[PDB]
Amino acid sequence: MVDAFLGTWKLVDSKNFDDYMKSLGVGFATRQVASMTKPTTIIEKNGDILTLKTHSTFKNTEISFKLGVEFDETTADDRKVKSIVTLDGGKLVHLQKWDGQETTLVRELIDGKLILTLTHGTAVCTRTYEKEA
Ligand SMILES: CCCCCCCCCCCCCCCCCCCCCC(=O)O
């Protein structure tokens, strides 16, 4: 179900990430560094457990989760959120909840590229990831 998402992915296009970060209250200096960063995302599974790593020159994160089971997460911008990841229409949908707020991180495969759509408030960001061999 999730297997075409697995592997190492490199950022190759970003649209509106500053809008998304600003909506979350990320400070200007952080947004500035993050606008030039090209993370690597690694998605691996071991049975029912997925591990999603995001690596860059500015910040690393790692989460492990079971699809459909809530987990605690501390985001790159230090929000303490309640998270759940599920497959929905073949997309990997990550919902974060905190302080009555929500944001979604939706990953889809289109022509072998990984498209990540980030929504918070009215801000919508689209990031495109290609495969690393
Ligand atoms: C994911 C952190 C990776 C480190 C890269 C250097 C900074 C860019 C990521 C964000 C760190 C700055 C704070 C804002 C983070 C917002 C929420 C997560 C968005 C992930 C976008 C994506 O996975 O492409």
Swiss-Prot record:
Note on domains (UniProt): Forms a beta-barrel structure that accommodates the hydrophobic ligand in its interior.
Stated family: Belongs to the calycin superfamily. Fatty-acid binding protein (FABP) family.
Annotated GO biological process: brown fat cell differentiation; cholesterol homeostasis; fatty acid metabolic process; intracellular lipid transport; long-chain fatty acid transport; negative regulation of cell population proliferation; phospholipid homeostasis; positive regulation of long-chain fatty acid import into cell
Subcellular location: Cytoplasm
Organism: Homo sapiens (Human)
Predominant cellular place of this UniProt entry's protein: cytoplasm
Gene: FABP3
Summary of the function given for this chain in its UniProt record: FABPs are thought to play a role in the intracellular transport of long-chain fatty acids and their acyl-CoA esters.
Protein name: Fatty acid-binding protein, heart
